[PDB]
């Protein structure tokens, strides 16, 4: 009896992948400071982002299969190179370094004398600088060299731009949509009872860190435990905190900028003498706040590893510095902190057997993150003492393979892949494409 | 905005206009662009208009020539989801609906462009002469 009829705009979608753009909230642009991080031409965010809750809908999510992570990961990487392209390349810094021990703590800093090319190509320049032990390597008084020269080339980051993370909303173009999981407890896998849609994702700060998720999103009620394959010890375990952890990372060295001239037109910023406290970089964590969280977190692992079992914590096993330490950026400088003091504990079924704690941190200006070869970035010196306060919102953890599985299990800080850091904020999001065209049988026919 | 996706097809016909609007047009709109990350905010919106005109051809070449809803002279085959009328709109949902028609979807498409607007417009030419 009936007849076919074309309906346009029916609620039908399929899971797919597209190219997502950013959103800066149109305030980051007023923050200026010559293109901070991403925001330059960055899409300002709709003042009123729209979130529509879909009733009577259940959708299955997988955060580990999420494509927004891979795009974001490649975005930061592509973003990094574009920042270093217009800046000043440090290529003729491979000159011999004659170094000596700084005036305590086994001479971590080296005072190095070397020859340099001036604006003119005729006469050289005899000048000295100050490099960390991590930035230099001796070759056989004490003679050193740049640590990256044998591996690759090097370029200096511009002092105008800042590495300051700013909120970035990922949005989808026309024909696409972004799904948001509104449940309080979600491990990133399984069906999602309450699903809402948004044009733009929430504020996401691209904070690059290791062993500690900084400035991230808090969980709801109970703390969350996420892992790709849990019984598998080869897979990292992502944790989401309820309450934020106060962390202080400072640069207890009050410095000055040389701004030496290697012209014509170019000026390099050398690290001058340190005026102030003679100290190594340090990281503070309040003993009461970390413990309280630990007691709550260690109980969540027993929802899997069993009601009663012994959970012991320990510092990093070994590997690259990026893996073994907490790597991040504060005030433009890159800190590498020793977390061994926090991870020293042993817990009972519900319990573990002072007013403050500190963590030794190391500073490295010349870095290759993401296993990049051919390009090394030099972090420019900062005037004065740098102080920063951030939230610790989560961790990257790995389980040991030694078993004795039915006895006890030990967990250690993870590292490596930075996608996990983005999976922390993107677990509730996935990309689907909308299929508007539809057909239905009805009597109307046509004349 | 997609709110009736969980609801029945009968209820999903009321908010049909909303999906048409938001889906159709999406301009932020920002002129600024750069050599890298400017090509990223381009490649996305260029694919948007390519996917769009792809849909619009079907609306024109079929018996619609207009948006939202339009009808046709193609009779509904029994072999295509033999059902009850109240079992479709009142008791069933679109996602659940498109699930079954997946086999006959390409067949119906042929009936719209060939059996109608190819043979209908020609029929019209023969009926408009007298």
């Amino acid at each position: 009896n009936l007849w076919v009829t074309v309906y346009y705009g029916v609620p039908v979608w399929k899971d797919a992948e597209t190219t997502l753009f950013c959103a800066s909230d149109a305030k980051a642009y007023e923050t200026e400071k010559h293109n901070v991080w991403a925001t330059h031409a960055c899409v300002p965010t709709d003042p009123n982002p729209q979130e529509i809750h879909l009733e009577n809908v259940t959708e299955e999510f997988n955060m580990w299969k999420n494509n927004m992570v891979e795009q974001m990961h490649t975005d930061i990487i592509s973003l990094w190179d574009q920042s270093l392209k217009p800046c000043v390349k440090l290529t003729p810094l491979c000159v011999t370094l004659q170094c000596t021990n700084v005036t305590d703590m086994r001479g971590e800093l080296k005072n190095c004398s070397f020859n340099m090319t001036t604006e003119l190509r005729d006469k050289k320049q005899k000048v000295y600088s100050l490099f960390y032990r991590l930035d230099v390597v001796q070759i056989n008084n004490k003679e050193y060299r740049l640590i990256n020269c044998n591996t690759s080339a090097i370029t200096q980051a511009c002092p105008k731009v800042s590495f300051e993370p700013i909120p970035i909303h990922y949005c989808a173009p026309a024909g696409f949509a972004i799904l948001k999981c509104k449940d309080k407890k979600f491990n990133g896998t399984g069906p999602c009872p309450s699903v809402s849609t948004v044009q733009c994702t929430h504020g996401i700060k691209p904070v690059v860190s290791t062993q500690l998720l900084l400035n991230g999103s808090l969980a709801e009620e109970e703390v969350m435990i996420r892992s790709e394959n849990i019984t598998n010890n080869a897979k990292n375990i992502l944790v989401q905190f309820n309450t934020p952890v106060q962390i202080n990372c400072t640069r207890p060295n009050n410095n000055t900028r040389k701004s030496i001239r290697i012209g014509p037109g170019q000026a390099f910023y050398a690290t001058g003498d340190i005026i102030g406290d003679i100290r190594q970089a340090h990281c503070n964590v309040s003993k009461a706040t970390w413990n309280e969280t630990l007691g709550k977190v260690v109980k969540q692992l027993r929802k899997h590893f069993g009601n009663n079992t012994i959970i012991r914590f320990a510092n990093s096993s070994g590997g690259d510095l990026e893996v073994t330490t907490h790597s991040f950026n504060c005030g433009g400088e890159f800190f590498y902190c020793n977390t061994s003091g926090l991870f020293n504990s042993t817990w009972i079924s519900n319990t573990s057997v002072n007013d403050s704690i500190t963590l030794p941190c190391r500073i490295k200006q010349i870095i290759n993150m993401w296993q990049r070869i051919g390009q090394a970035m030099y972090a420019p010196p900062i005037q004065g003492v740098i102080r920063c306060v951030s939230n610790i919102t989560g961790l990257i953890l790995t389980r040991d393979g030694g078993s004795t599985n039915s006895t006890t299990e030990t967990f250690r800080p993870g590292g490596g892949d930075m996608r996990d850091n983005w999976r922390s904020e993107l677990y509730k999001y996935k990309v689907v494409k909308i299929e508007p065209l539809g057909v239905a049988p009805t009597r109307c026919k046509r004349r | 905005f997609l709110g009736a996706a969980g609801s029945t097809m009968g209820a999903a016909s009321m908010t049909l206009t909303v999906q048409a609007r938001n889906l159709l047009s999406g301009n932020p709109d920002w002129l600024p662009d750069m050599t890298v990350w400017g090509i990223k905010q381009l490649q996305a919106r260029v694919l948007a208009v390519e996917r769009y005109l792809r849909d619009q051809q079907l609306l024109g070449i079929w018996g619609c020539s207009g948006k939202l809803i339009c009808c046709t002279n193609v009779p509904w085959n029994s072999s295509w989801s033999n059902r009850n009328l109240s079992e479709i709109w009142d008791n069933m949902t679109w996602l659940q609906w498109d699930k079954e028609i997946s086999n006959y979807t390409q067949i119906i498409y042929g009936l719209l462009e060939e059996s109608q607007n190819q043979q209908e417009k020609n029929e019209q030419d023969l009926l408009a002469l007298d």
């Epitope: 259940t58 299955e60 997988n62 | 072999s79 295509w80």
Partner: antibody, heavy 132, light 109 residues
Amino acid sequence: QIHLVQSGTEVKKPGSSVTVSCKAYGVNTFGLYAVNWVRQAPGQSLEYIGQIWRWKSSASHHFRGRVLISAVDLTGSSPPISSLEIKNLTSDDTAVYFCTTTSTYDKWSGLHHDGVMAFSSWGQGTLISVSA
Amino acid sequence: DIQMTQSPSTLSASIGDTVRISCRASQSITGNWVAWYQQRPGKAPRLLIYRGAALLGGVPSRFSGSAAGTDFTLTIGNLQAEDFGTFYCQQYDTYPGTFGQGTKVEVKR
């Protein structure tokens, strides 16, 4: 990959209660995977008993309420495990029981049809002989 | 409650032959929700085709399904040794799923 390892052979007497377990190896979770329990009578065809999907246990009108399907997700020491119980055992329940699962993540897959589905992965099977 | 009828209950076919096993449902299944399983003796049954023609990945191209209305048929061309066993047709169209009588594919000689 995906491996479904069930319990050993259970021989039980009428009136008693039986518990079989299904260890699902390779499965990330029962959230993205629906678990169906299917039995096969000797010399006869296959019969669908029940399922647990989106962590919701369900079963056919033959067995309503008399068959209980329970499951726990992936843990830190073992893969996701499901168990099927039949109380008030009789002599007609001697069929061979199979633990099955299907990937439900694909929303437009022909595998599933709103709770009722095909069965992609099959277990080793467990024979239950009820005799005194 | 659907009832699946397979024909025949058992058959004799040789190597290289084209084997056709049909099946009929107590009602008409549209959306083509039908599955075909293979079971070798002493082994758990394996899933071959879903949605009546949609072959699962890793299955040889020799197997072909067909789905129209109440009548369903599975077509196997160029029969080989490993193909012999008992086959079942199943409908997941409605709650609950029901299988067929079963068809024993037996070696010809």
